[PDB]
Amino acid sequence: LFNTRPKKFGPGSRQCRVCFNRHGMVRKYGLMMCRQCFRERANQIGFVKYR
Amino acid sequence: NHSVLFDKATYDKLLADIPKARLITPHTVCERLKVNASLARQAIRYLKDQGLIKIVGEHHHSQYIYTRNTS
Amino acid sequence: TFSYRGVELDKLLDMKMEDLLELFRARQRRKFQRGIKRKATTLMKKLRISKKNCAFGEPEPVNTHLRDLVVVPEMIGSVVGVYNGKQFINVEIKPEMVGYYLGEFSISYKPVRHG
Amino acid sequence: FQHILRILNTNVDGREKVVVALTAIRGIGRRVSNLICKKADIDTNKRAGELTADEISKVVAIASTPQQFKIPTWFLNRQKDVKDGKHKHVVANGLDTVWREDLERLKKMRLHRGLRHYWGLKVRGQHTKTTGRHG
Amino acid sequence: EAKLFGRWSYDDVNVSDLSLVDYIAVKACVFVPHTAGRYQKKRFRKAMCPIVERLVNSMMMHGRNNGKKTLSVRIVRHAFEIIHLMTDKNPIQVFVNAVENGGPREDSTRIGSAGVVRRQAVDVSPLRRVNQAIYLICTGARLAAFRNIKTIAECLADEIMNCAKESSNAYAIKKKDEIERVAKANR
Amino acid sequence: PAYLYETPLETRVHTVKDVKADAFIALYANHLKKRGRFQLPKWIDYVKTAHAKELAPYDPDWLYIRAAAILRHLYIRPDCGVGGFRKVFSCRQRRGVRPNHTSKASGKIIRYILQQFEEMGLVESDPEKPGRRLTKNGQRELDVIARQCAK
Amino acid sequence: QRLHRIRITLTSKDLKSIERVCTELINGAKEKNLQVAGPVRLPVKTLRITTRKSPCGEGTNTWDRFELRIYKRLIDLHSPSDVVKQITSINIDPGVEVEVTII
RNA sequence: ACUGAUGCAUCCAACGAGUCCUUGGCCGAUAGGUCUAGGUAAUCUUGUGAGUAUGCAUCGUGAUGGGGAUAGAUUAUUGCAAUUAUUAAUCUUCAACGAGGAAUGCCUAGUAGGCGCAAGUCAGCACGUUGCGCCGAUUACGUCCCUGCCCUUUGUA
């Protein structure tokens, strides 16, 4: 009637939980993390970069 | 540039022509002759079975390379 | 004479659309089986009743947004005002036009004329 | 021996093999020409400069009516004709006249697709900012 | 033992002339031109390889034909058979006498004494004369058969025999004398 | 100068792996004609053997050599099926202007030849066990002609 | 009681957390002297994400190479389930997921 | 283009990744569909039978079968919807381009280059990026000439 399309798939369906942003959405292993959001909190999750 | 059929004038010569030469290849037939390389393969395959000539090496699938038989 | 296919325009309205689809390209059939709901189904009523309203001698312009509706030999000889983007434009749909989509006929933009 | 040839109002060349010589006819190509050669019982080892009167007469019959010799329809060029409504094979200067019909159909219909042929731009929806430039 | 393709013996034969001796690697030797081994850590491991390996190695060009050593083994295996066919003796002795005469003697370097790009006469080393020899052998044979319907093996066999010879028809023996044309003048 | 070298003993001619695989197919393709049993498809005029291939095969006995090759390939890997045999006769498709990729083989022709071997009963299910396998009569059909070809 | 067979999974992010548990629980078994086999070290499932460093497009296009590591390790036993509950329940580690399984 | 293209046969990788990845059997030229079926994964897909490669045939230097743009017509697939055509197929249609002008980039050993595969974005779409292997060369082991850099003495409006 109003205020809803079919919203099931594509970038419009889903957003970053931390900052509410669709762009740059890391969905590997079911993160649902926007990249700007993901890199700074990556050490606190577990991810430690080397080589 | 080249003639595609046997040319049955030159077939009577071609018994004499190729066993003279030292190199026998794809190229040396259309050197002596002016015909496409393809006939040369079926020529030197015919000169294996009917005629005289012998393989330099047992075989290859790309470069044939026969000698005159020397007999 | 010169309708659209081997099947003539006398017969087609009579022919059922469901079995009609077999004589269709590849996307019309896919679209039709999936189809149809909502406001294409209202135009199956509305464009049909648009034929009777004129007194005679062969219409009046029914406005639509649906570019994605495929035309059908039920509704031939009608008129459809198809949406570009701001304006509606007139399309008197013919015996020949069956098969194709509506929004193919109405263009979105002006072609060129550089300089 | 015959240098040069003509089948179906189109000039087929000698000095070429029989399968590849038949692709010089418009509306014929490589895979169908094998099916023409196999079902006409022509030897593919033979050259197109030869071609006896039996060999050409079979090819014209198959090129005209390939439905008769059990070619199963997906091989055909204009599959479902959209006029008489049958599985049809278009060969030679028929294909020129069919292309003149089908384009000038779309100009009268006034599709978007027909106007691309009228102006002579790219039809299939390709990015013509940079590409297809020179004209 | 040690024979190339098993039909030839490394044992016997000899270097043609003084210089370019010991730089060449014969004597001991491996059946099959090919060897995957480390030859580019020091700067004179390059003349430990036998020159039949350096022929098949440098025969792959350009971008399209690089790699596929197995392919370059075949066409050299045919080339050594053809060399044997004409002026039969040893394919290797004809090949070693070819790469003797193939490369250039002298060369023009740019030494200006500040400011100018001015040429000057300089003799070529024994290693570079072997490097240039095998390069110039192939680039004749590749260019000869690039558009012609002549097998590369044919070009290579022909090119090698010509180089041993003083015919000058070859691309290599021309490009020797083309450098020695200007290298005479730059004295 | 003749070619050197042997193995220490003269090689045993018994099983199919000792035979060179191309020379096996040259014999057993001719065996399928002269025996008679195996039987033709209708579609042989069409095909080409794969979605990827842009042309039909030149040799008119392309089916017999394929049925020869697949039957020995059961002896190499016992357990396999139709999606397996789609991979083994894969090939470089040429996409066009784009870069090249792999593609799978034709499923009709590869399935049909197995059903004709099932009718004789050389290769068979395996209804519960996933994948086809050659039976007892399948081996003795192979191994009797392994000794013949080298002879 | 009955003749049973137990094979206990161990997983964590750290190496040092599991090397406590592997040393402790085998010595905890050797209190009672059960039929122990040693800890079967499976291959390491390294997880990987590569994002761009910059928020926007500017500069050279540089990349992180982030990594997790996960260490599946398996203590084997042949003993009934009532015996093992004493061994596992004491000496639980911080941030180490452990699951006991018969067969 | 002939160290090649095409058709047959031979037999070899590593990185991943999945609550979607897909074996097995039937139907279909193809795509794909249909009925069972294993998998929370060193267990199942999968030992992912990857392609340059190798062996045996036909083609013959012709813009030819090299090249596959441009274009008509048909059959499936994702989606609620495919027209300005999301792709994948089947038949045709058969252009430019014969080694690239002046300028100028990348690179020293499992490296260059070539050949594939996997993941990221993703309902569907890679000619892109990030990793992974395979086949595997040529030429230096020096230099401050060009283009920049670092440290001294020196000149400066």
Any idea where the domains of chain A sit in the sequence? 1-51
Q: Where are the domains of chain F?
A: 1-151
Question: Alpha-carbon Rg of chain E, whole angstroms?
Answer: 17
Query: Do E101 and E163 meet the contact criterion of CB atoms below 8 Å apart?
Result: yes
Chains C and G touch (3+ CB pairs under 8 A): no
CB D127 under 7 Å to nucleic chain H: no
Helix axes E69-85, E51-58, angle to 10 degrees: 120
Triad B27, B31, B35: Cα angle to 5°: 85
- Rounded to the nearest angstrom, the minimum Cα separation between D31 and chain F is 6
Q: How was this structure determined?
A: cryo-EM
Which of D74, D78, D82 should we substitute to test contact with C (largest number of C Cβ atoms within 10 Å)? D82
**C80-83, strands of its sheet edge to edge:** C62-64, C80-83, C88-91
Task: From F86, F92, F128, select the one nearest F109 (Cα to Cα).
Answer: F86
Helix axes E126-144, E171-185, angle to 10 degrees: 130
Distances (CA, A) of F136 to F13, F119, F143: 20, 15, 11
Q: Which nucleotides of H are covered by protein (CB under 7 A)?
A: 1-4, 6-11, 15-19, 22-32, 42, 46-62, 64-65, 68-85, 88-94, 99, 109-110, 112-117, 119-124, 126-131, 135-141
**Among all chains, which residue has been given the structure tokens 């390379």?**
B65
CB contact under 8 A, D85 and C107: no
Q: How far is the CA of C84 from the C1' of H127 (A)?
A: 33
Fold of A1-51: 30s Ribosomal Protein S14; Chain N (4.10.830)
Both ends of chain A: CA-CA distance in Å?
54
Which of A33, A39, A44 should we substitute to test contact with G (largest number of G Cβ atoms within 10 Å)? A39
Distances (CA, A) of C112 to A39, C115, D100, D119, D121: 47, 9, 26, 10, 11
Cβ neighbours for D108, distance < 8 A, ≥ 6 positions apart: C96
Amino acid at D86: K
Task: Quote the CA–CA distance of E177 and E165 in Å, as a whole number.
Answer: 14
Helices (H), chain F: 21-35, 62-76, 82-88, 107-120, 136-150
DSSP state of F30: H
Query: Do E18 and E100 meet the contact criterion of CB atoms below 8 Å apart?
Result: no
Considering only CB atoms, G67 lies closest to which of A24, A26, A50, namely A50
Any E CB within 8 A of B63 CB:
yes
CB contact under 8 A, E75 and B57: no
Q: Dihedral sign for Cα F33, F34, F37, F42, please.
A: positive
Task: From E76, D15, E153, E150, select the one nearest B28 (Cα to Cα).
Answer: E150
Strand partners, G40: G74
Task: Quote the CA–CA distance of G75 and G8 in Å, as a whole number.
Answer: 5
Chains A and E touch (3+ CB pairs under 8 A): no
Strand partners, D78: D88
For chain D, domains (ranges, CATH) are 1-72 (1.10.8.50), 73-135 (no CATH)
Amino acid at G30: K
Secondary structure class of F80 (helix, strand, coil): strand
H or E stretch at E173 = helix E171-185
DSSP state of E125: P
Helices (H), E8-151: 51-58, 69-85, 91-102, 126-144
CB contact under 8 A, F48 and D31: yes
Q: Does domain E1-187 have CATH number 1.10.455.10?
A: yes
Considering only CB atoms, A51 lies closest to which of G49, G52, G65, namely G65
DSSP state of B67: E
DSSP state of C104: T
- Rounded to the nearest angstrom, the minimum Cα separation between D82 and chain C is 5
Task: Quote the CA–CA distance of E78 and B55 in Å, as a whole number.
Answer: 12
Task: Dig out the tokens for F2 from the structure.
Answer: 């003749």
Buried b or exposed e, range A12-46, using 16+ CB within 10 angstroms: eeeebeeeeeeebbbeeeebebbbbbbbeebeeee
Task: Quote the CA–CA distance of G96 and E167 in Å, as a whole number.
Answer: 82
* Nucleic chain H contacts, protein chain F, residues 88-147, CB cut-off 7 A: 88-102, 104, 106-109, 111, 114-115, 118, 125-126, 130-132
Query: Do E134 and E102 meet the contact criterion of CB atoms below 8 Å apart?
Result: yes
Give D97: exposed, middle or buried? Use CB within 10 Å, 0-12, 13-18, 19+: exposed
Amino acid at D14: G
Task: Quote the CA–CA distance of E57 and E45 in Å, as a whole number.
Answer: 15
Among protein residues, the one whose C-alpha sits closest to the C1' atom of H52 is E68
Q: What is the resolution of this structure in A?
A: 3.3
Instruction: Identify the contact set of chain D against chain C, taking CB-CB distances under 8 A.
Output: 82-86, 105, 108-113, 115, 119
CB contact under 8 A, A35 and G13: no
Query: Do G79 and G6 meet the contact criterion of CB atoms below 8 Å apart?
Result: yes
- Rounded to the nearest angstrom, the minimum Cα separation between D44 and chain B is 14
Secondary structure class of B18 (helix, strand, coil): helix
Backbone angles phi, psi at G36, to 5 degrees: -90, 135
Q: Where are the domains of chain G?
A: 1-103
G-chain residues near A28 (CB < 8 A): 49
Strand partners, E141: none
CB contact under 8 A, F3 and E7: yes
Cβ neighbours for F27, distance < 8 A, ≥ 6 positions apart: F145, F148, F149
Any D CB within 8 A of B5 CB:
yes
CB E134 under 7 Å to nucleic chain H: yes
Distances (CA, A) of B32 to B25, B66, D6, E155: 11, 15, 33, 18
CB A27 under 7 Å to nucleic chain H: yes
**Among all chains, which residue has been given the structure tokens 């003048």?**
E185
Backbone angles phi, psi at B16, to 5 degrees: -75, -35
Cβ neighbours for A51, distance < 8 A, ≥ 6 positions apart: G65
Amino acid at E151: T
Cβ neighbours for E55, distance < 8 A, ≥ 6 positions apart: E33, E76, E95, E134, E137, E138
Task: Quote the CA–CA distance of G72 and G24 in Å, as a whole number.
Answer: 17
Buried b or exposed e, range D12-39, using 16+ CB within 10 angstroms: bebebbbbebbeebbbbeeebbbbbbeb
Cβ neighbours for E118, distance < 8 A, ≥ 6 positions apart: E110, E111, E112
Task: Quote the CA–CA distance of C85 and C60 in Å, as a whole number.
Answer: 21
CA dihedral D22, D25, D29, D31 (to 10 degrees): -30
Query: Do E68 and E60 meet the contact criterion of CB atoms below 8 Å apart?
Result: yes
Quote the longest CA-to-CA distance of chain D.
Answer: 54
Query: Do A33 and A46 meet the contact criterion of CB atoms below 8 Å apart?
Result: no
> DSSP string of G45-102?
EEEEE--BSSSSS-SS--B--EEEEE--EEEEE-S-HHHHHHHHHSS--TT-EEE--B
Question: Alpha-carbon Rg of chain D, whole angstroms?
Answer: 19
Which of C104, C106, C110, C112 should we substitute to test contact with D (largest number of D Cβ atoms within 10 Å)? C104
Task: Quote the CA–CA distance of A33 and E6 in Å, as a whole number.
Answer: 65
Considering only CB atoms, C105 lies closest to which of D82, D83, D111, namely D111
H or E stretch at C63 = strand C62-64
Q: Report the relative pairing of strands G37-41 and A25-26 from DSSP bridges.
A: unpaired
Helix axes E152-164, E171-185, angle to 10 degrees: 50
Strand partners, E109: E120
Q: Where are the domains of chain B?
A: 1-71
* Nucleic chain H contacts, protein chain E, residues 60-99, CB cut-off 7 A: 60-72, 74-75
Which CATH number does G1-103 carry?
3.30.70.600
Cβ neighbours for A21, distance < 8 A, ≥ 6 positions apart: A15, A34, A36, A37
Query: Do D22 and F47 meet the contact criterion of CB atoms below 8 Å apart?
Result: no
- Rounded to the nearest angstrom, the minimum Cα separation between D88 and chain B is 36
* Chain centroid to CA E99: 5
Task: Quote the CA–CA distance of C52 and C80 in Å, as a whole number.
Answer: 15
Task: Quote the CA–CA distance of F71 and F114 in Å, as a whole number.
Answer: 9
Task: Quote the CA–CA distance of D50 and B5 in Å, as a whole number.
Answer: 10
CB D82 under 7 Å to nucleic chain H: yes
The residue count of chain F comes to 151
Buried b or exposed e, range F86-100, using 16+ CB within 10 angstroms: beebeeebeeeeeee
Query: Do C4 and C94 meet the contact criterion of CB atoms below 8 Å apart?
Result: no
Task: Quote the CA–CA distance of F58 and F39 in Å, as a whole number.
Answer: 20
F-chain residues near E6 (CB < 8 A): 1, 3-5
Backbone angles phi, psi at E122, to 5 degrees: -140, 130
Q: How many CB atoms lie within 10 A of CB D109?
A: 15
Distances (CA, A) of D94 to C6, D26, D30, D78, D98: 20, 9, 19, 11, 6
Task: Quote the CA–CA distance of A17 and F1 in Å, as a whole number.
Answer: 79
Secondary structure class of B57 (helix, strand, coil): coil
Both ends of chain D: CA-CA distance in Å?
44
Any D CB within 8 A of B4 CB:
yes
Tell which D residues from 26 to 85 touch B, by Cβ distance under 8 Å: 47, 49
Task: Dig out the tokens for E164 from the structure.
Answer: 């041993």
Secondary structure class of D102 (helix, strand, coil): helix
Task: Quote the CA–CA distance of F45 and D36 in Å, as a whole number.
Answer: 10
